[PDB]
Design a protein around this ligand. Structure first.
Ligand code: CHL
Ligand code: CLA
Ligand code: CLA
Ligand code: CLA
Ligand code: CLA
Ligand code: CLA
Ligand code: CLA
Ligand code: CLA
Ligand SMILES: CC(/C=C/C=C(C)/C=C/[C@@]12O[C@]1(C)C[C@@H](O)CC2(C)C)=C\C=C\C=C(C)\C=C\C=C(C)\C=C\[C@@]12O[C@]1(C)C[C@@H](O)CC2(C)C
Ligand SMILES: CC1=C[C@H](O)CC(C)(C)[C@H]1/C=C/C(C)=C/C=C/C(C)=C/C=C/C=C(C)/C=C/C=C(C)/C=C/C1=C(C)C[C@H](O)CC1(C)C
Ligand code: SF4
Ligand code: FES
Ligand SMILES: [Ca+2]
Lengths: 208, 97, 743, 221, 42
């Protein structure tokens, strides 16, 4: 709600679309297909981009740290791709069922709050407990914000949030690259990086 | 919504107010300035008239020349007054030619 | 005066809002539906551009971009053909042994037992045998690996996207104006010299550098993988000079004018290649060279911008005499202001051309290994005959549209049109008479023959054994065509085709490619039947065109339009007076004529042309040669052709040809289903819909868009559409099953 | 103002404000009557300018190596023709520090960065000197005319601060550009027909004129 | 984009999608339980 009129623009010289004013964080005026020209569409897709970005960041960590310290002899975690099968104390379908129950509860809560803000705030068993964040997609409270780190007043919250959305975009792209490299090649990503670094002028995709 | 209508007529020129979702004829019927009609169904030329200004919705109009709606004539009984209009009455024959 | 590019910027804006409002083009449809009739009209008037508006500029812009859309579609279909040849085909194995592997470029998934349709087509492959003749084209092109087929599929996909973008561009961003379209002299100069001249020159080039050497290597016996790539022939030229010494001098002759030194690969042989059963490639390259020269010169006739040339108006105005008044004065103004006149002339010529293509491609087979592939030959002849007939009928449709909507002696007067209009009565009288006389003297002979054969009087028949009717002129002409090479054509060796004669027979793989076709009493009868059918079709269509505006029965017919049901039951009853109804009636007669043409060709080829030859040299034809003696009665057509050759299709259940057995029956069903629409009328149907609607109302489940019965004209159109589909599909299944089964 | 094959149509709109305006337009491409996309006359003048500039560069560059292949310590393995350096791999390739495909991608990246900005100057004149570019924006303002942007970058030495200056220099520029365009076309069709290289071709013609042009119509390959 | 959402709900497109999905469903059912003449369960 501070309509920055001359922000940075992904394509310099363009004139941004009318619905991309400057209020939202991480705004750069990129919607050439016009997929966010309706306010309800825009807010829904804001939630979708946010949650995708946080999921992608978790995933990018969980690949690229364990792989970079598996190449180095720190740990012995198998290939993130082939880690789908190497079997644990149970099988996988039951593991999936318990994950399903657990995470589906939380996603239904987030659902409720997306369609009716602040209407699931407190706990039924313990009504005294209450989430303290007043925006959708930024829950706060003790569980999601015990450090108080998040809640503040603009120019401070707006920058932190833009930083979040940019990290998230890079993480989405990162895990996408991990996938497509390990499907194109039959390697690990850190192997790709080391090979390309040892011969940049030749160890590109144009090796087949 | 309910724009003001103006109708030149041998009786004179009178105004009445009436919502855009209506046909002109029943609205001149309301206040009581008599106009000539036969069909009330858009299939003859007794309710014919032309316009001084603005323009009138002729979506549900039929039995007209592929021009009668581009050079002025209008049937008052199947017409929605989208604007504050100023129209003619008793205009069948200079339409009939 | 001068010729230039003329364009407007951004005439219409790209938007989706008009997609969500159905029927934006017509004011009546835009209003929205009350009854279901709306939904039909929305589709019937979708491409009637000159009825959505009055402005000629808008109609021409729409036509141009619609043409781009059609070209994009055609490119996508070509892309599919090449991709399927590359990915799901047995083309390489067929390339290895063409006279044993039957071609196949479509496989099916194993879903409900339908994998039985994946039949043994030879070469370690199981699928559907195709009859479009694409392998023959790809071999005549020089294609020897599936990578080239992939490459052409990708190129065609790119070209399709390009066409679609150009279609959007010329309508929404850079739309040419009317004066650009109305320049016909520059257009003709470009299509004659640029599209047809440069096209066949470039193609002659490709045949000289790729098709000729690769086919020389293939006919020499070399493995299709050990043949050099085409571009090698261009980089290293000694490869070419080994096969054709003339490629050593290399364009010095073409300038030194000693064209004789190219006689290596530019020949005038005539006849077939006795190794592959096709025309000599050295003849086809020389042909294309000559055609390119002719067209490139002919594209320099009309004046555009430099004085020199011909004015079309001047040519037309110069022609007139004492029988025709002022004729041809006023046709340039007409042929530049109506799209329907242009479309009629163009459709007439393209349909006739397609029929000529059918004849010439059976009689002088262009591709290698096509003549002995009997299914492909039958398929191609039949397909192209059907296309030609349909286009000729559309020609009449659009001549009638021009007569109803565009002809106007008040502002564009032409004399010849006026005089034909002023003696249409005598015209239609004489044509009517000649069709009656022609029908008596051709079908009547068949009826005489059947009755004499059933009355135990075969010596009173019209046949080669009793009462001969030999086509002397046809025999005389093909005898002249036999003696031609050496006497009236000293530069030719063999004559143009093997059907003319001379006692020369060409065989391939123990099959008969070509031999002299004998003309007899049966040929005389069949040809007069054909003249009869064509004359009748002409009578119907020309009567529809000439009386499109007025009659002695309805003197103001032009005011009722081009497509109207009737003018009521009075005057005796006036159903089907419109010109649309004449087109509707002419479609049935075109179907009749083309069906008889393809039956005559199919029976004659098997009976006296196709078959197998023995090493001793005794030809056994597919059918025994029974066309000369059984074709002269109707009972012989019912017995020896239909009943005896439907055996293959009524016995395909359980084999890989069972899809044809299913389509046979489905097509019979669709044909019989159309008779319901053709024999009835909409009053009965609307009254039945009344009671059904009552039943729905009883349960609060009745629809708000009130159901109506179809229109009168829509009833006729649905009827003829299903009739044609049913009949043509029946013959399709019959032909393909029969020809694929025996061979 | 000398005229070459002028006409009363071309001579209408070709008044003379443009450098090297010779009234030669036998096809009538500059006619402002029905102008649309990429047929507008300003874009055609800009396109001639850019074609000529790149042609001067490329025409001097495609002959430079095989000239220095004959004079100096320049190593002959780095003395190739313009068609046997990698431009047409079926005619000769090399082994640089990269792949020739990575080379294509990287060169396209750099030229995308250059040409998208040059265009955006053409379209909304004055756009690029407004958004942040790590500095590098104070010099990319422009001059109102696309083909002559000026600034601290494209004119360091400050040539032509008057009108006669600029007109005379612009004339010489477009004329040399046309000459180099002709030269590049000649390069192409010579290097196909005789198939040896333009410098070698010139040196094979300077000796004897026996095999000037029509001799090579035998087209060895 | 809203206009596209409307257009996608026009009758021919809606029916096309509905029946393509139905076809996939029946095809996969028959690929899993082929050649069924009876209800063999209960
Ligand atoms: C966001 C969640 C998630 C993602 C991205 C993946 C991704 C993957 N898993 Mg996993 N999984 C995920 C969740 C889970 N998996 C499993 C259980 C397994 C098993 C048992 C296996 C995998 C395997 C795989 C791979 C399948 C290979 C392939 O081409 O698949 C299909 C790919 C797509 C459909 C493309 C999707 C991308 C989208 C943009 C389109 C793949 C990289 C397999 C493997 O290791 O293969 C070697 C394997 O066997 N996963 C469980 C249960 C605990 C999960 C619970 O959330
Ligand atoms: C699921 C991912 C996702 C989603 C939902 C969004 C959503 C959004 N983005 Mg974003 N973006 C993304 C990914 C995504 N983005 C990535 C990865 C990048 C880095 C390349 C960007 C860079 C970016 C910029 C610079 C900007 C946005 C902006 C926006 C907002 C504008 C509204 C809109 O685009 O309509 C709705 C969005 C969708 C309907 C999602 C589209 C999904 C399509 C169908 C994917 C198509 C396939 C893809 C092209 C190819 C995938 C393969 C590839 C990964 C190899 C919107 C909320 C603008 C903004 O102001 O942000 C606030 C803006 O300026 N985005
Ligand atoms: C959404 C993110 C995500 C997901 C789905 C996974 C999923 C998985 N991780 Mg992983 N991980 C993540 C994030 C994620 N991780 C992050 C952010 C880090 C820190 C960089 C790690 C570091 C990590 C390590 C070091 C290891 C795994 C392992 C595993 C595998 C099974 C054991 C396990 O999950 O730990 C158990 C979680 C409990 C709550 C118990 C499993 C496929 C282990 C494995 O591969 O097994 C050999 C293993 O060695 N992860
Ligand atoms: C538009 C069609 C076309 C095209 C593009 C080409 C192209 C080519 N022809 Mg050619 N040619 C053509 C038609 C064509 N031809 C026809 C119709 C004939 C019959 C008169 C010839 C007869 C011919 C000869 C005799 C020779 C060429 C040769 C060549 C190549 C020489 C390279 C060159 O100088 O240019 C070249 C790739 C030369 C060659 O083979 O180079 C390898 C050669 O000597 N052509
Ligand atoms: C270059 C070829 C060409 C072109 C451009 C046109 C163009 C035109 N024609 Mg025309 N016509 C042509 C050839 C052509 N025609 C031929 C060959 C014939 C002979 C049959 C006709 C006969 C004809 C008639 C009788 C009429 C036109 C009319 C029209 C106008 C409106 C057409 C329309 O939108 O209807 C809408 C198109 C459809 C509703 C599609 C019909 C679908 C058919 C019936 C189904 C075919 C089955 C399919 C092939 C296979 C079955 C698939 C199925 C099993 C799934 C339009 C300007 C009409 C007119 O009024 O002119 C002003 C008119 O009534 N044409
Ligand atoms: C009337 C029937 C007839 C027909 C259809 C042909 C057809 C043909 N003759 Mg021919 N000719 C004929 C009678 C005929 N001739 C007679 C009666 C004689 C005297 C015995 C000749 C003597 C003759 C000779 C000597 C030659 C031909 C040649 C040709 C072929 C090339 C045509 C040509 O030169 O283009 C047309 C040339 C023009 C200048 C256009 C003129 C337009 C015409 C004359 C009208 C061609 C297929 C040539 C050949 O052998 O081809 C390989 C050739 O050498 N003819
Ligand atoms: C835009 C015009 C243009 C283009 C596309 C090229 C392109 C090329 N030049 Mg060239 N050159 C040009 C203009 C151009 N030049 C000009 C104007 C001159 C001076 C008149 C030269 C003088 C020149 C020489 C002397 C050589 C090349 C060489 C090369 C090739 C490799 C250069 C290289 O390694 O990159 C650059 C790498 C860097 C680290 C910098 C390459 C295909 C080299 C070659 O391949 O030898 C045959 C070679 O030695 N060029
Ligand atoms: C009124 C006509 C009619 C009837 C009654 C049937 C009946 C049947 N057909 Mg048949 N069919 C017909 C017309 C008909 N067909 C026509 C006209 C054709 C030509 C197009 C075909 C072509 C055809 C083929 C190719 C096949 C069948 C098959 C079958 C059997 C499938 C059983 C099944 O799907 O499993 C069970 C399906 C379900 C239980 C679906 C219900 C589940 C829902 C979606 C979930 C609801 C949960 C609550 C079944 C007995 C198949 C077969 O196996 O034959 C023996 C098969 O192969 N049909
Ligand atoms: C790339 C991507 C989205 C890209 C979208 C783009 C570009 C759209 C752009 C545009 O539409 C806009 C915006 C506006 C339009 O006008 C224009 C276009 C251009 C159309 C999302 C990726 C999103 C990627 C995500 C969310 C990734 C999450 C990954 C996780 C959770 C990892 C889980 C794992 O646990 C497994 C399962 C196995 C474990 O062993 C290991 C690991 C691998 C760690
Ligand atoms: C005027 C007119 C008008 C009228 O009306 C008509 C007419 C007549 C048609 C017209 C025209 C004429 C003409 C002549 C034209 C032409 C132009 C040109 C030539 C261009 C070029 C142009 C050209 C160009 C750009 C070029 C460029 C180039 C370059 C860069 C190069 C590069 C290179 C090099 C260095 C080397 C390497 O190894 C290779 C390469 C990489 C390759
Ligand atoms: S309504 Fe039908 S039956 Fe009656 S006159 Fe017209 S076409 Fe003939
Ligand atoms: S009464 Fe005739 S139109 Fe209304
Ligand atoms: Ca122009």
């Amino acid at each position: 709600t501070v309509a920055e009129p001359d922000r940075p623009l992904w394509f310099p010289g363009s004139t941004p679309p009318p619905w991309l004013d400057g209020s939202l964080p991480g705004d750069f005026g990129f919607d050439p297909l016009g997929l966010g020209s309706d306010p309800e569409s825009l807010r829904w897709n804001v939630q979708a981009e946010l949650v995708h970005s946080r999921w992608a960041m978790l995933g990018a960590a969980g690949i690229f740290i364990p792989e970079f310290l598996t190449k180095l002899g720190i740990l012995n975690t198998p290939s993130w791709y082939t880690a789908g099968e190497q079997e644990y104390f149970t099988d996988t379908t039951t593991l999936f069922i318990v994950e399903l129950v657990f995470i589906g509860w939380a996603e239904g809560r987030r659902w409720a709050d997306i369609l009716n803000p602040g209407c699931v705030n407190t706990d039924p068993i313990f009504p005294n407990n209450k989430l303290t964040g007043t925006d959708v997609g930024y829950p706060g409270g003790l569980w999601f914000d015990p450090l108080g780190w998040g809640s503040a007043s603009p120019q401070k919250l707006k920058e932190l949030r833009t930083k979040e959305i940019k990290n998230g975009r890079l993480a989405m792209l990162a895990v996408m690259g991990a996938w497509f490299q390990h499907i194109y090649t039959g390697t690990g990503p850190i192997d790709n990086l080391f090979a390309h670094l040892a011969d940049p002028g030749h160890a590109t995709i144009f090796a087949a | 919504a309910s724009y003001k209508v103006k109708l030149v007529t041998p009786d004179g020129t009178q105004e009445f107010e009436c919502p855009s979702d209506v046909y002109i004829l029943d609205h001149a019927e309301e206040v009581g300035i008599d106009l000539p009609y036969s069909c009330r169904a858009g299939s003859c030329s007794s309710c014919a008239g032309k316009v001084v200004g603005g323009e009138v919705d002729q979506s549900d109009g039929s039995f007209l020349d592929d021009e009668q709606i581009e050079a002025g004539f209008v049937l008052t009984c199947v017409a929605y007054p989208t604007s504050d209009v100023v129209i003619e009455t008793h205009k069948e024959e200079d339409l009939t030619a | 005066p001068e010729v230039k590019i003329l364009v407007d910027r951004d005439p219409i804006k790209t938007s989706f809002e008009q997609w969500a409002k159905p029927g934006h083009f017509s004011r009546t449809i835009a209003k929205g539906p009350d009854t279901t009739t709306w939904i039909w009209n929305l589709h019937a008037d979708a491409h009637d551009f000159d009825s959505h508006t009055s402005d000629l500029e808008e109609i021409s812009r729409k036509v141009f971009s619609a043409h781009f859309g059609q070209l994009s579609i055609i490119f996508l279909w070509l892309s599919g053909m090449y991709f399927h040849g590359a990915r799901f085909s047995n083309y390489e194995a067929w390339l290895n042994d063409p006279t044993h592997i039957r071609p196949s470029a479509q496989v099916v998934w194993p879903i409900v037992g339908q994998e039985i349709l994946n039949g043994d087509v030879g070469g370690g492959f199981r699928g559907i045998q195709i009859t479009s003749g694409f392998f023959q084209i790809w071999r005549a092109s020089g294609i020897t690996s599936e990578l080239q087929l992939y490459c052409t599929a990708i190129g065609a996909l790119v070209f399709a996207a390009l066409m679609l973008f150009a279609g959007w561009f010329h309508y929404h961003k850079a739309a040419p104006k009317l004066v650009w379209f109305q320049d016909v002299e520059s257009m003709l100069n470009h299509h004659l010299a640029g599209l047809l001249g440069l096209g066949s020159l470039s193609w002659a080039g490709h045949q000289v550098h790729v098709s000729l050497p690769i086919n020389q290597f293939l006919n020499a016996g070399v493995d299709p993988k050990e043949i050099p790539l085409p571009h090698e022939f261009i980089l290293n030229r000694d490869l070419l000079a080994q096969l054709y010494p003339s490629f050593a001098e290399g364009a010095t002759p073409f300038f030194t004018l000693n064209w004789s030194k190219y006689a290596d690969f530019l020949t005038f042989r005539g006849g077939l290649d006795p190794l592959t059963g096709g025309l000599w490639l050295t003849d086809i390259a020389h042909h294309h060279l000559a055609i390119a020269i002719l067209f490139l010169i002919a594209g320099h006739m009309y004046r555009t911008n430099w004085g020199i040339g011909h004015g079309i108006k001047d040519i037309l105005e110069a022609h007139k005499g004492p029988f025709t008044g002022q004729g041809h004065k006023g046709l340039y103004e007409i042929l530049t202001t109506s799209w329907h006149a242009q479309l009629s002339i163009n459709l007439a010529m393209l349909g006739s051309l397609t029929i000529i293509v059918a004849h010439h491609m059976y009689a002088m087979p262009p591709y290698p290994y096509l003549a002995t592939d009997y299914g492909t030959q039958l398929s191609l002849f039949t397909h192209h005959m059907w296309i030609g007939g349909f286009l000729i009928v559309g020609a009449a449709a659009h001549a009638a549209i021009f007569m109803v909507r565009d002809y106007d002696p008040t502002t564009r007067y032409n004399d010849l049109l006026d005089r034909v209009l002023r003696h249409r009565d005598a015209i239609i009288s004489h044509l009517n008479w000649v069709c009656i006389f022609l029908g008596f003297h051709s079908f009547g002979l068949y009826i005489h023959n059947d009755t004499m054969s059933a009355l135990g009087r075969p010596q009173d028949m019209f046949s080669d054994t009793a009462i001969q009717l030999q086509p002397v002129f046809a025999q005389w002409i093909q005898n002249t065509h036999a003696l031609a090479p050496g006497t009236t054509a000293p530069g030719a060796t063999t004559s143009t085709s093997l059907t003319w004669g001379g006692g020369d027979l060409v065989s391939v793989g123990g099959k008969v490619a070509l031999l002299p076709i004998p003309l007899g009493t049966a040929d005389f009868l069949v040809h007069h039947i054909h003249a009869f059918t064509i004359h009748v079709t002409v009578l119907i269509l020309l009567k529809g065109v000439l009386f499109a505006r007025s009659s002695r029965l309805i003197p103001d017919k032009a005011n009722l339009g081009f497509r109207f049901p009737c003018d009521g039951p009075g005057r005796g009853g006036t159903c089907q007076v419109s010109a649309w109804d004449h087109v509707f009636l002419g479609l049935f007669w075109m179907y009749n004529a083309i069906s008889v043409v393809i039956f005559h060709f199919s029976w004659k080829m098997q009976s006296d042309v196709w078959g197998s030859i023995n090493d001793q040299g005794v030809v056994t034809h597919i059918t025994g040669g029974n066309f000369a003696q059984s074709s002269i009665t109707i009972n012989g057509w019912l017995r020896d052709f239909l009943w005896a050759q439907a055996s293959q299709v009524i016995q395909s259940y359980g084999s890989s040809l069972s899809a044809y057995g299913l389509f046979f029956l489905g097509a019979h069903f669709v044909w019989a289903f159309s008779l319901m629409f053709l024999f009835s009328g909409r009053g009965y149907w609307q009254e039945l819909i009344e009671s059904i609607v009552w039943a729905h109302n009883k349960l609060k489940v009745a629809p708000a868009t009130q159901p109506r019965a179809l229109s009168i004209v829509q009833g006729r159109a649905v009827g003829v559409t299903h009739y044609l589909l049913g009949g043509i599909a029946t013959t399709w299944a019959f032909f393909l099953a029969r020809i694929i089964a025996v061979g | 103002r000398p005229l070459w094959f002028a006409s009363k149509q071309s001579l209408s709109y070709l008044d003379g404000s443009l450098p090297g305006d010779y009234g030669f337009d036998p096809l009538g491409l500059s006619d402002p009557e029905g102008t649309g996309g990429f047929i507008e006359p300003r874009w055609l003048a800009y396109g001639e300018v850019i074609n000529g500039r790149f042609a001067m560069l490329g025409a001097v560059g495609a002959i430079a190596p095989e000239y220095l292949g004959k004079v100096g310590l320049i190593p002959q393995e780095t003395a190739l023709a313009w068609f046997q350096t990698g431009v047409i791999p079926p005619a000769g390739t090399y082994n640089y520090w990269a792949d020739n495909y990575t080379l294509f991608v990287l060169e396209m990246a750099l030229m995308g960065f250059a040409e998208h900005r040059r265009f955006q100057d053409w379209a909304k004149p004055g756009s690029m000197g407004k958004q942040y570019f790590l500095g590098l924006e104070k010099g990319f303002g422009g001059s109102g005319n696309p083909a002559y942007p000026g600034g601290p970058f494209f004119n360091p030495l400050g040539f032509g601060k008057d009108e006669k200056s600029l007109k005379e220099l612009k004339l010489k520029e477009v004329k040399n550009g046309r000459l180099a365009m002709l030269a590049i076309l000649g390069y192409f069709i010579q290097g196909l027909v005789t198939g040896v290289g333009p410098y070698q071709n010139l040196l094979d013609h300077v000796a004897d004129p026996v095999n000037n042009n029509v001799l090579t119509s035998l087209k060895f390959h | 984009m809203r206009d596209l959402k409307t257009y996608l709900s026009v009758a021919p497109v809606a029916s096309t999608l509905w029946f393509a999905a139905l076809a996939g469903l029946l095809i996969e059912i028959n690929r899993f339980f082929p050649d069924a003449l009876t209800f063999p369960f209960f």
